């Protein structure tokens, strides 16, 4: 029927002066563009078909041709930057924005999907979509008393597209676009579908990634408790972006950080820190590191929640990248902690796993660890206990590792490791 045509046949049909022939030919193009094994996107582009498809977007009298073009353009825009750029150069942005208003939900949804792919290309197209005025009609599609009455695939596409309009960093989206979208995003974050929740968390994660002014506008909407609740979800696709967003927030001010603490976040961390998914452990440990970089009373909350043995555990055994984050969490904690906090850290068993790590071929971890040693010595000094500390480092084999590091081909390692022996060994 319209299955398996050549591109030259599709060209013949689209150039006929017959709307029905054009329709058949567009659907044929769509079915070519819908196969998983190498769809001939470049062949279609090379044939000159994009501008014709874009003009079919405007055929209100022909709803089926509007849909097949939408779908064909969707799949093209789904390709490389060059393929997406061809769609945009065809004038497809305003035309897809106009179709958001279609009375046909399947057509309106296809327009949403296409705009998602265009914004997903990066900063410039995201921003180009926003200048065309996509946001208002996108949001007007979600202006319903209850989200549950929308078709679910449709709601998912809206959510994902809005999330691509929040994404990317150099530059971040316009402040006023972010302000416009946030209220609706807060609503979607309370919706009960897992994909809608996952992609709402992704959007919040994009929006909390950067300067503290951007964190602020999110935290101000009061989403942190709902984030923390999602952080406890059983679905890994929801936990991953909820954790990234929580982690982005605690890179912010002490007050912003305190908000995730007040939300109950640290109660979820015994399991996040022992999560069998190695990426959740990494991210959770990085998160812990920025909380240990907080106030003393924030550090104290890490203590009260029983989290320091979990940090010992991760430093002891974890994929190397997680250990690296753990080393940071310790360096931070020892640099901002009370002496009593640091004594506590040592009582939990930090020394021996910290020393084992000095065998790592990774200049940066070594610096981070020597820094933590020095910080801990500085607390031992204040208590007349450096000798008691030197013995533990000695007994676990830490001196051999510090001694070996003097002749290290790195100016920072040599200085601080000779300095440690000078002062303590």
């Amino acid at each position: 029927g319209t299955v398996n045509w050549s591109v030259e046949d599709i060209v013949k049909g689209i150039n006929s002066n017959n709307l029905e022939s054009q329709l058949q030919a567009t659907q044929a193009a769509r079915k070519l563009l819908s196969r998983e094994k190498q769809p001939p996107i470049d062949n279609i582009i090379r044939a000159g078909l994009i501008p014709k498809f874009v003009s079919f977007l405007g055929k209100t009298d022909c709803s089926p041709i509007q849909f097949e073009s939408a779908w064909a353009l969707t799949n093209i825009a789904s390709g490389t930057s060059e393929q997406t750029k061809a769609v945009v150069d065809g004038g497809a942005i305003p035309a897809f924005i106009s179709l958001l208003a279609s009375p046909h939900a399947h057509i309106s949804e296809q327009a949403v999907w296409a705009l998602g792919n265009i914004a997903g290309d990066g900063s410039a197209f995201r921003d180009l979509v926003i200048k065309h005025g996509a946001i208002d009609p996108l949001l007007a599609l979600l202006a319903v008393p209850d989200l549950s009455t929308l078709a679910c695939g449709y709601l998912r596409n809206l959510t994902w597209t809005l999330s691509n309009l929040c994404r990317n960093k150099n530059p971040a989206p316009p402040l006023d676009a972010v302000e416009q979208i946030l209220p609706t995003l807060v609503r979607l974050l309370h919706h009960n579908d897992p994909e809608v929740l996952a992609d709402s968390c992704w959007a919040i994660s994009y929006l909390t990634d950067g300067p503290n002014e951007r964190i602020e506008m999110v935290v101000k909407k009061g989403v942190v408790p709902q984030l923390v609740k999602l952080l406890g979800a059983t679905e890994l696709p929801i936990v991953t972006p909820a954790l990234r967003a929580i982690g982005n927030i605690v890179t912010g001010t002490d007050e912003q950080t305190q908000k995730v603490i007040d939300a109950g976040a640290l109660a979820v961390f015994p399991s996040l820190l022992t999560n069998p998914k190695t990426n959740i452990q990494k991210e959770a440990t990085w998160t812990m590191s920025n909380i240990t970089a907080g106030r003393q009373d924030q550090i104290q909350q890490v203590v009260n929640h029983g989290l320091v043995p979990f940090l010992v555990g991760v430093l002891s055994k974890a994929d190397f990248k997680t250990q690296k984050e753990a080393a940071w969490a310790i360096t931070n904690y020892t640099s901002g902690g009370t002496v009593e906090q640091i004594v506590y850290l040592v009582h939990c068993g930090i020394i021996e796993p910290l020393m084992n790590l000095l065998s790592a071929k990774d200049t940066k971890i070594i610096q981070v660890i020597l820094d933590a040693i020095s910080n801990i010595f500085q607390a031992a000094e204040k208590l007349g206990e450096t000798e008691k500390l030197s013995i533990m480092i000695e007994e676990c084999g830490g001196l051999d590792k510090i001694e070996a590091l003097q002749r290290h081909e790195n100016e920072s390692v040599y200085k601080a490791s000779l300095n440690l022996i000078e002062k303590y060994f």
């Binding site: 819908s34 779908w71 998602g116 290309d121 990634d209 990234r244 990085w286 920025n290 970089a293 931070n332």
Partner: peptide, 19 residues
């Protein structure tokens, strides 16, 4: 500020073909 802000980029699907 001991805060470290620049995580490994991560997201949902960037682009998506229909079927």
């Amino acid at each position: 500020s001991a805060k470290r802000k620049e995580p490994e980029p991560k997201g949902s699907t960037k682009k998506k073909a229909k079927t």
